[PDB]
Amino acid sequence: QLIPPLINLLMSIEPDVIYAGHDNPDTSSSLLTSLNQLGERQLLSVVKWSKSLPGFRNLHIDDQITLIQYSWMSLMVFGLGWRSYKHVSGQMLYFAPDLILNEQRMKESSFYSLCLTMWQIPQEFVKLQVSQEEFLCMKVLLLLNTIPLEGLRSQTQFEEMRSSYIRELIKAIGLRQKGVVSSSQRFYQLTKLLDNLHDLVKQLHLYCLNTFIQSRALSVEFPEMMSEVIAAQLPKILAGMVKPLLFHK
Amino acid sequence: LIPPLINLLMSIEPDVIYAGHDNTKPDTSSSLLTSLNQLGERQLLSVVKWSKSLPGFRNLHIDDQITLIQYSWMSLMVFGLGWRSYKHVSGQMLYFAPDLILNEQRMKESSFYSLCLTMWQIPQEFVKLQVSQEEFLCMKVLLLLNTIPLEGLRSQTQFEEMRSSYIRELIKAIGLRQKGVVSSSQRFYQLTKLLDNLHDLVKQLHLYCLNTFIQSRALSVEFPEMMSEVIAAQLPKILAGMVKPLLFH
Numbered sequence: 001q002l003i004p005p006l007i008n009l010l011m012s013i014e015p016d017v018i019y020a021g022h023d024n025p026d027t028s029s030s031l032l033t034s035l036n037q038l039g040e041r042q043l044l045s046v047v048k049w050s051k052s053l054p055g056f057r058n059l060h061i062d063d064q065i066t067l068i069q070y071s072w073m074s075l076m077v078f079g080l081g082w083r084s085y086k087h088v089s090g091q092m093l094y095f096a097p098d099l100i101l102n103e104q105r106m107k108e109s110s111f112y113s114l115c116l117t118m119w120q121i122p123q124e125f126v127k128l129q130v131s132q133e134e135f136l137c138m139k140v141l142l143l144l145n146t147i148p149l150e151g152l153r154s155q156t157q158f159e160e161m162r163s164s165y166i167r168e169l170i171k172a173i174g175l176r177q178k179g180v181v182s183s184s185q186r187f188y189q190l191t192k193l194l195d196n197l198h199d200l201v202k203q204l205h206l207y208c209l210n211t212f213i214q215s216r217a218l219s220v221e222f223p224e225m226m227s228e229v230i231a232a233q234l235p236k237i238l239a240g241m242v243k244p245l246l247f248h249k
Numbered sequence: 250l251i252p253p254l255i256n257l258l259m260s261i262e263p264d265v266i267y268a269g270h271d272n273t274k275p276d277t278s279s280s281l282l283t284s285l286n287q288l289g290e291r292q293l294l295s296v297v298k299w300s301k302s303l304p305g306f307r308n309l310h311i312d313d314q315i316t317l318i319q320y321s322w323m324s325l326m327v328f329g330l331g332w333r334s335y336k337h338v339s340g341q342m343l344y345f346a347p348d349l350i351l352n353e354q355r356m357k358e359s360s361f362y363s364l365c366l367t368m369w370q371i372p373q374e375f376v377k378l379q380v381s382q383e384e385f386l387c388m389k390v391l392l393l394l395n396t397i398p399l400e401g402l403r404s405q406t407q408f409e410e411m412r413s414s415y416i417r418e419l420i421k422a423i424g425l426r427q428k429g430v431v432s433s434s435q436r437f438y439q440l441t442k443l444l445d446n447l448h449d450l451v452k453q454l455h456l457y458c459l460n461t462f463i464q465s466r467a468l469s470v471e472f473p474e475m476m477s478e479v480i481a482a483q484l485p486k487i488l489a490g491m492v493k494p495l496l497f498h
């Protein structure tokens with residue numbers, strides 16, 4: 001087609017729709033447990049996606065697991081932004097077809113604040129008019145956007161993969177942004193959106209880990225696979241003991 | 250010839266606290282950490298009582314007092330470990346308590362030799378500097394007052410007055426021994442740098458502690474009541490850097 005084959009591949013490997021299983025009165029705590037229930041199902045889906053993503057299975061298995069444990073929440077908030085942009089024009093948060101939040105369902109002050117943070121992504125998607133082909137290549141680069149302070153075991157292959165998906169994003173931008181000046185500026189805008197996600201996700205990581213270490217008292221359930229990625233890396237990530245990659249100074 | 254506020258600090262200094270540790274039984278990774286945290290809980294209770302006696306502290310807002318103890322406990326307790334090790338065993342063993350003393354061979358046998366080396370840095374620095382009791386008592390008050398919230402304190406004006414008063418007192422304590430002008434100025438720089446350096450050493454202890462707390466059931470490590478409360482109140486936020494560490498340099 002005019003659509004490059006790697007992008008059409010990324011489109012075919014996107015996860016199908018995941019339901020939260022929410023029991024449809026609204027309450028902050030039961031809402032949070034439903035959000036983490038959904039997060040467990042989405043985590044399964046991200047690891048399956050990774051198994052089909054070109055290049056990723058060839059990195060050392062420890063690097064595969066480290067990059068999923070670093071990037072899971074960033075990938076899931078970026079997909080929440082896509083669904084919300086696409087289904088409700090960014091104006092509600094479309095966590096799943098059975099768990100769509102508007103402002104009436106955001107009652108407790110810290111819950112609404114966290115939603116506003118997440119709401120930044122679909123607002124930028126609406127402003128910039130991000131395309132599916134852009135979003136698919138961006139989402140790979142977010143998987144690949146933090147490494148350990150000592151680097152990865154397959155650092156060479158990693159660097160090759162990340163360059164390949166930067167070239168692919170350039171192709172995605174080229175589908176629509178025809179000028180030299182305009183497609184350069186578009187590359188800048190998209191890559192700076194990805195750099196800015198590191199600071200957005202830090203607030204969600206802190207709230208997550210604070211809730212997780214008193215989850216019993218809070219009556220907030222975290223499922224087993226999500227509890228493992230939290231316990232394995234979150235405190236180290238929050239402490240700054242990882243290397244976030246940036247496109248811009 | 251000792252200034253009255255320092256004599257007061259000496260008078261209110263906690264007494265030595267026993268761990269009640271059973272040195273019949275060989276060290277086990279779980280039993281050694283559980284006994285360390287039981288002793289830490291008793292030392293934390295004592296720091297709370299000390300703070301009720303420390304001039305100025307009871308006149309800050311009660312939420313400020315709680316926050317400053319939640320931010321500084323680890324720093325206070327490591328600094329107190331350093332002083333007892335220097336005073337009682339010439340700095341050459343870690344003197345957690347009179348019944349819980351780790352010489353280097355017991356450190357090496359423990360599963361925690363690296364952590365023990367990191368904490369044993371502090372008494373070795375006290376030996377190198379020949380820190381006096383009057384300098385230590387003032388430095389320890391400044392560790393209580395060495396981090397504030399990003400938004401400041403409710404009693405920010407009273408806090409600054411208090412913290413400046415204890416800086417002035419450290420300057421008087423230096424003057425007891427350092428009679429020359431340049432020597433005295435250099436010693437103020439050295440001791441205040443020692444304090445600034447402790448932020449980085451304590452970050453390492455805070456990360457291990459929070460990982461141990463998350464994994465406490467798996468690892469059979471007990472965390473007593475007040476210790477748990479302060480870890481769950483602030484430790485993720487401190488490790489995220491969402492507080493303001495005060496530096497002298």
Ligand SMILES: C[C@@H]1C[C@H]2[C@@H]3CCC4=CC(=O)C=C[C@]4(C)[C@@]3(Cl)[C@@H](O)C[C@]2(C)[C@@]1(OC(=O)c1ccco1)C(=O)CCl
Nearest residue numbers: 032035036038039076077080095111114204207208211
């Ligand atoms: C602030 C965090 C960040 C949250 C994730 C964002 C990314 C995300 C997107 C999804 O579509 C489904 C689940 C997750 C993976 C989230 Cl909503 C949940 O697990 C729920 C998460 C972890 C989190 O969400 C909230 O606290 C929250 C979300 C909305 C309002 O409060 C939380 O700590 C639950 Cl206790």
Ligand SMILES: C[C@@H]1C[C@H]2[C@@H]3CCC4=CC(=O)C=C[C@]4(C)[C@@]3(Cl)[C@@H](O)C[C@]2(C)[C@@]1(OC(=O)c1ccco1)C(=O)CCl
Nearest residue numbers: 282285286288289326327330345361364454457458461
């Ligand atoms: C690495 C940390 C730092 C430790 C504190 C240092 C400061 C301290 C000084 C004490 O005398 C009593 C207790 C504490 C408060 C410590 Cl030893 C314990 O709670 C035990 C603490 C938190 C800690 O200690 C160790 O892990 C450890 C290994 C060997 C010595 O300490 C821990 O995480 C245990 Cl869960």
